Amino acid sequence: DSINTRIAEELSALPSGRVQPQQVAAAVALLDEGSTVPFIARYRKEVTGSLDDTQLRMLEERLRYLRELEERRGAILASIEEQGKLTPELARDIKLADTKTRLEDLYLPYKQKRRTKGQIALEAGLGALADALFDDPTLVPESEAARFVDAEKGFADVKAVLEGAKYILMERFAEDATLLDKLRVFMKNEATLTARVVPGKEQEGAKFSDYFEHDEPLKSAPSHRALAIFRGRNEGVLSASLKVGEEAPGTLHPCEVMIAERFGLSNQGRAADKWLAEVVRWTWKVKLYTHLETDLFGELRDGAEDEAISVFARNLHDLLLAAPAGPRATLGLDPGLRTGVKVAVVDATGKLLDTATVYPHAPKNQWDQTLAVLAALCAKHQVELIAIGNGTASRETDKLAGELIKKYPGMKLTKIMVSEAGASVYSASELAAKEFPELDVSLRGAVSIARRLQDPLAELVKIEPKSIGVGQYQHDVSQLKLARSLDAVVEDCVNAVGVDVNTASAALLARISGLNSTLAQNIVAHRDANGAFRTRDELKKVSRLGEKTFEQAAGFLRVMNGDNPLDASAVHPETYPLVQRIAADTERDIRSLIGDSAFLKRLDPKKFTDETFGLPTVTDILKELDKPGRDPRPEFKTAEFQEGVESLKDLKPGMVLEGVVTNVTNFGAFVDIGVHQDGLVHISALSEKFVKDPYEVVKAGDIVKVKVMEVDIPRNRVGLSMRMSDTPG
């Protein structure tokens, strides 16, 4: 209610644009109402106002976090009330608490506390001294302390009394909300991070030679550097700490001042003044400091991880939508050395046909023999492709894969490279072990290396997302965080490609919106029992399949040579009628379908608007019959396809070929694609991060990957970009 608000401003910080609290209201109303993100970003944009996935996904997360913040907010309210202290003012502070940190600060005085020496001092009645001195600095400490001495209570000497009464104040000051908020905000805009080496561990972990010594402004630190430092620190090598100016010999700490002001404690020269100054210092050096550090470090870590996990998100996303090369015969080669390189021949349907393990490289060295064995296998099964893992020793295996294809030209093979990401975790998996109880673990990996070349999406959904190692220190990162995120991309990708309920493995189905590890297997059940589905309509006869479920997955499932032709289109059964009430301009002939710009073109919206659908519900419909169930994935190109591009005519908006920069100007950079015409590349779309001047980034002679953004055959021009983000649209 005020949650839509906090979410609005978060969403409004993304390239997307500005989001209205009202939009988020609707979207949240849909979620709690059991809908799935992919569903809303697709069949409800109206009820939201064209909010996209990237937006919804973040809303979904901030949504979850804030609600936790609310649940915990109540437990506090309950707790403090039950104690007899829920003041109206405190109550108001609690409501307004923005973060979970301010929320926990406010609870401090009331949180269940251990037997701190301050409580002992209290019970010994040293609470009066604590207030007398603090309340009136002209009193004389040591003198007034004499009055509270008591050997039996744990305060035998005057010096004890004073020390005890010190912790009473230390504890009060170190739990003040307003203060903790001030010192924190200060320590984060002024303090500077510092890293050091432990006397001894110097040689031991020289891995952090770039941080064994370092000092930089905390307010702005890079994810990597930050993660590195904690990495070494946690590893037991480095020592981190924050600092503000220099603590010298003997100067007033900036924060020790704020602490005093907060309680109007000035040091004129009164009796208590010196003693009160002592308790202010101890409050900072014994309490407040380690607290702030912990709060702050854990904030930086929490931030560094976000980033890293954001990069991992992109990496996986790109891999999942790699171009599917199959259905052809493939020979997966998971490179290896000492343990040989595994071999696995799959068929044009995914069916494993043969396996083998050869030792061509070191230590053994059976290069020629290996070549003989592969040849035999490539012929025996009319192999067409050769997927090669990008892991260890792939360098020489690609050299070996070469010797091969150029010794049996009659075979017409083509070698390709693929990520081994997950190959292992998968091999050790139970799903894999259930399909190939016979194959050894090392060989189950090569089956994946092969099946993915054919279709990356299908094969990758069979691995625990968070395990498809795409990033570097991906393991070092928070797993729940990383998990719930990588799961997000996967869900986003498969629903963005559709699924043929008639051949999809139970794994792929579980990732369709509105489906679980259950209804999945269940779909297979029918398929296995009743043959084949002819229309989404028949998905209703599935065992547990329900109305909310159907409505939620029907749009992403897809019957191919079904009866209702509109079941191969992203078109939800929800609009079947809206599509039929197009009897007007009765092109019902095979349905206007695939009727391209031929009539179908535009056909001015406003066509249909009953109270429910009406626009980006229908003017996406029009973009569908035009080319039903189109594959958002890139068309497949070989490894040397470019060698086939010579003219300006051999290009279509989309390609990502390699080029060389021949000129760098202050308004972009001209590139040669080997088409006898240079391509301009605007400074803007030259990179992903903003560019001050082309001269710093790219330079003549440089080689780079670019995406042909537009082709004008008449003018003989070429539009290009060094960023794969934007599209030639």
Side-chain angles (χ1 to χ4, degrees), residues 36 52 76 118 131 186 194 199 226 260 381 399 435 452 485 518 553 567 576 580 583 591 603 610 663 684 708:
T36 68
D52 40 292
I76 288 174
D131 299 30
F186 178 79
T194 282
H381 312 90
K399 173 175 167 48
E435 174 188 48
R452 66 181 69 180
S485 147
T518 307
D567 277 42
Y576 278 161
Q580 168 58 304
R591 300 306 190 304
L603 308 164
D610 245 320
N663 278 290
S684 56
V708 51

Side-chain angles (χ1 to χ4, degrees), residues 302-317:
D302 271 323
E305 300 193 308
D306 280 23
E307 269 277 55
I309 302 176
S310 191
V311 195
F312 299 165
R314 216 298 166 296
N315 287 342
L316 176 61
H317 181 279

Side-chain angles (χ1 to χ4, degrees), residues 349-411:
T349 72
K351 171 180 198 153
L352 168 75
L353 304 178
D354 254 348
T355 77
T357 143
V358 302
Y359 305 67
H361 309 114
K364 291 194 183 182
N365 282 307
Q366 306 192 312
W367 193 274
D368 311 298
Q369 192 184 51
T370 298
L371 270 166
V373 170
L374 290 178
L377 271 168
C378 280
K380 189 171 186 174
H381 312 90
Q382 308 206 315
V383 154
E384 311 208 326
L385 303 168
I386 299 191
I388 313 181
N390 67 181
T392 296
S394 50
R395 165 193 251 63
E396 324 83 294
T397 304
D398 196 60
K399 173 175 167 48
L400 187 290
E403 224 110 303
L404 181 82
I405 98 286
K406 80 168 297 172
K407 233 65 72 188
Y408 306 66
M411 300 216 249

Side-chain angles (χ1 to χ4, degrees), residues 594-602 626:
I594 191 64
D596 284 53
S597 290
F599 195 61
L600 194 71
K601 176 84 289 78
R602 310 311 305 177
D626 182 309

Side-chain angles (χ1 to χ4, degrees), residues 93-329:
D93 291 46
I94 297 304
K95 193 224 305 183
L96 305 174
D98 288 81
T99 71
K100 284 181 169 182
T101 311
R102 312 284 263 301
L103 180 64
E104 288 302 347
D105 280 359
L106 244 34
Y107 189 34
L108 282 177
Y110 316 100
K111 173 185 274 70
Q112 156 79 306
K113 64 200 71 184
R114 298 176 165 190
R115 201 84 193 302
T116 183
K117 51 183 58 175
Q119 271 69 319
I120 297 167
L122 285 165
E123 309 191 7
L126 299 186
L129 215 195
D131 299 30
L133 288 178
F134 169 98
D135 180 59
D136 187 2
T138 65
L139 292 198
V140 188
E142 55 284 1
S143 286
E144 302 284 337
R147 289 178 163 177
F148 305 72
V149 184
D150 183 312
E152 181 63 292
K153 280 191 168 188
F155 297 101
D157 126 80
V158 55
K159 186 186 63 184
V161 174
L162 285 189
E163 172 180 46
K166 184 163 64 182
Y167 278 93
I168 282 171
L169 289 176
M170 281 176 58
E171 290 184 34
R172 279 177 194 169
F173 300 166
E175 67 168 5
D176 174 280
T178 317
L179 183 64
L180 275 163
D181 206 3
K182 272 291 181 172
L183 289 181
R184 202 177 286 127
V185 175
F186 178 79
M187 287 304 279
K188 191 190 187 304
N189 297 324
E190 277 70 53
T192 41
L193 188 70
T194 282
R196 256 64 180 178
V197 306
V198 179
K201 321 297 282 66
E202 286 146 339
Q203 192 244 66
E204 209 76 66
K207 173 187 170 186
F208 312 88
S209 51
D210 197 347
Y211 294 98
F212 186 90
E213 168 45 46
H214 187 201
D215 301 57
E216 70 167 294
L218 174 63
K219 185 212 285 285
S220 286
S223 314
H224 30 292
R225 230 171 298 169
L227 285 146
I229 301 172
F230 289 114
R231 212 139 58 205
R233 188 203 189 185
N234 224 291
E235 239 64 290
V237 171
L238 298 170
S239 285
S241 65
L242 303 185
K243 297 170 188 179
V244 202
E246 180 106 280
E247 41 92 80
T251 309
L252 184 57
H253 188 83
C255 286
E256 292 177 3
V257 181
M258 273 173 279
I259 301 180
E261 319 167 45
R262 211 291 167 187
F263 300 110
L265 289 173
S266 51
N267 198 161
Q268 332 294 203
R270 303 167 289 182
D273 284 25
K274 205 178 300 302
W275 183 73
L276 291 167
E278 147 178 287
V279 36
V280 176
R281 198 172 78 70
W282 283 46
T283 303
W284 165 259
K285 262 279 65 207
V286 171
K287 286 269 183 290
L288 283 194
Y289 178 87
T290 310
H291 188 163
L292 294 184
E293 176 172 287
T294 305
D295 278 3
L296 292 179
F297 275 178
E299 200 182 272
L300 179 57
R301 198 206 62 277
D302 271 323
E305 300 193 308
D306 280 23
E307 269 277 55
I309 302 176
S310 191
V311 195
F312 299 165
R314 216 298 166 296
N315 287 342
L316 176 61
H317 181 279
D318 290 347
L319 231 38
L320 287 190
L321 304 183
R328 302 189 207 162

